[PDB]
């Protein structure tokens, strides 16, 4: 036409002055938005006598921040690297991020905040507990320790450790929880009736001291032969001597453990405490046999009622340890 119209909207730029119509000869100026720099094309335009605006060669491109794609011992998500995009940071295993985790490209093309660096996780020398010693320790960095390094603790003699003995240098630079060495003592073990006890000749008995028990002839043990002084001050177990019992009835085949045995032959020297045997009893309902057990209890063994016993010489009847049924 003869009056030029509103200029074309150009991306990332602004036009001054901006009017719906211009007269021929009026001037408009394209200027890129902040953070965008002008490259190809020229901005200033003058209205021709014909209404048509000249073709626009101007191209505003975003300002480019310095390359930040390499983080030594780190990983960076970055995509574009130009205004106004942001980049993120991370570190590899054993490394902590020494600075801001995200940076942004400003209008001036300067990263803000400044770019971080990854630094190794370093752990201070471990502090030994009061009653403990350092069994092994290897400092990787100077006297300090790196990520996942270990120290193990050895308690002093006559002391008992509470808590795990291994400490790892963690991700946050602090050692894991430390064990405690305490001095614990154990009271003297009382001698068992009909038996003897042995311990070393010391005024006081401390941790892991062990006493050995015994019993005289005719008496067995119903506990562990060797007991130990545990971490809590009380002994591993208290054992006692329990009375062996006599063979209750001579001439009878009973069941000891898996197989069938004759009592008189199997326990010539008498039963021990807790030994379980089972007797055979006739049942006159269908003339079958069943099995009832009995066991020694500190010298007294109770024969089942159904055991009716007869002498072998009196072979008038059968020994009722016969038909398997029932
Ligand atoms: C060793 O330090 C660990 C970390 O504690 C903190 O770490 C520094 C980086 C710093 O922030 C400072 O304030 C502390 O020293 C202690 O462990 C815990 O670790 C948690 C797991 O990372 C953590 O918490 C997070 O998880 C919980 C549960 O999911 C969330 O509710 C919480 O918001 C966190 O995301 C926290 O850092 C820490 N918490 C506590 C109560 O300790 C650890 O105890 C310590 N060990 C020793 C022996 O001192
Ligand atoms: C040795 O002692 C531990 C510690 O428990 C004791 O219980 C108190 C009543 C008192 O006697 C203190 O000396 C101790 O704190 C015994 O462990 C206990 O076992 C049972 C199992 O449930 C129960 O009483 C408690 O849960 C346990 N104690 C704790 C602190 O949890 C242990 O039985 C004792 N004997 C032996 C052989 O270890
Ligand atoms: C390590 O050893 C001792 C610790 O007491 C100290 O004097 C020394 O300066 C330390 N050096 C380094 C590099 O950590
Ligand atoms: C705790 O001690 C046990 C030894 O009984 C060990 O196997 C375990 O690894 C220790 N805990 C940790 C976290 O290492």
Curated annotation (Swiss-Prot):
- Protein name in UniProt: Beta-2-glycoprotein 1
Keyword Transport among UniProt keywords: no
Q: Disulfide bonds, which pairs?
A: 4-47, 32-60, 65-105, 91-118, 123-169, 155-181, 186-229, 215-241, 245-296, 281-306, 288-326
The effect of residue 88 to N is:
In allele APOH*1
| GO MF annotations in UniProt | heparin binding; identical protein binding; lipase binding; lipid binding; lipoprotein lipase activator activity; phospholipid binding
Database matches in SUPFAM superfamilies? Complement control module/SCR domain
**What job does the chain carry out?**
Binds to various kinds of negatively charged substances such as heparin, phospholipids, and dextran sulfate. May prevent activation of the intrinsic blood coagulation cascade by binding to phospholipids on the surface of damaged cells.
Gene3D superfamilies recorded for this chain? Complement Module, domain 1
**Any one of the GO CC terms:** platelet dense granule lumen
């Amino acid at each position: 036409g003869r009056t030029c119209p509103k200029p074309d909207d150009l991306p990332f730029s602004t036009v001054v002055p901006l009017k719906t119509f211009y007269e021929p000869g009026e001037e408009i100026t394209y200027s890129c938005k902040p953070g965008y720099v002008s490259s190809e094309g020229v901005g200033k335009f003058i209205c021709p006598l014909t209404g048509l605006w000249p073709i626009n060669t101007l191209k505003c491109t975003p300002r480019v921040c310095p390359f930040a794609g390499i983080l030594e011992n780190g990983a960076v998500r970055y995509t574009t690297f130009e205004y106004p995009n942001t980049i993120s940071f991370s570190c590899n295993t054993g490394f902590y991020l020494n600075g801001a985790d995200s940076a942004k490209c400003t209008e001036e093309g300067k990263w803000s905040p400044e770019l971080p660096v990854c630094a190794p996780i370093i752990c201070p020398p471990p502090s030994i507990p009061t009653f403990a010693t350092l069994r092994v320790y290897k400092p990787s960095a100077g006297n300090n320790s790196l990520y996942r390094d270990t120290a193990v603790f050895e308690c002093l003699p006559q002391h008992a450790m509470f808590g795990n003995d291994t400490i790892t240098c963690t991700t946050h630079g602090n050692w894991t929880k430390l064990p405690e060495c305490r001095e614990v003592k154990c009271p003297f073990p009382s001698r068992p009736d009909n038996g003897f006890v042995n311990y070393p000749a010391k005024p006081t008995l401390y941790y892991k001291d062990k006493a050995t028990f015994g019993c005289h002839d005719g008496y067995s043990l119903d506990g562990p032969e060797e007991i130990e002084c545990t971490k809590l001050g009380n002994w591993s177990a208290m054992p006692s001597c329990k009375a062996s019992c006599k063979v209750p009835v001579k001439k009878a085949t009973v069941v000891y453990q898996g197989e069938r045995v004759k009592i008189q032959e199997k326990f010539k020297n008498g039963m021990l405490h807790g030994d379980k045997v089972s007797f055979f009893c006739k049942n006159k309902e269908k003339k079958c046999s069943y099995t009832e057990d009995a066991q020694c209890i500190d010298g007294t063994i109770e024969v089942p009622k159904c055991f009716k016993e007869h002498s072998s010489l009196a072979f008038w009847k059968t020994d009722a340890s016969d038909v398997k049924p029932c």
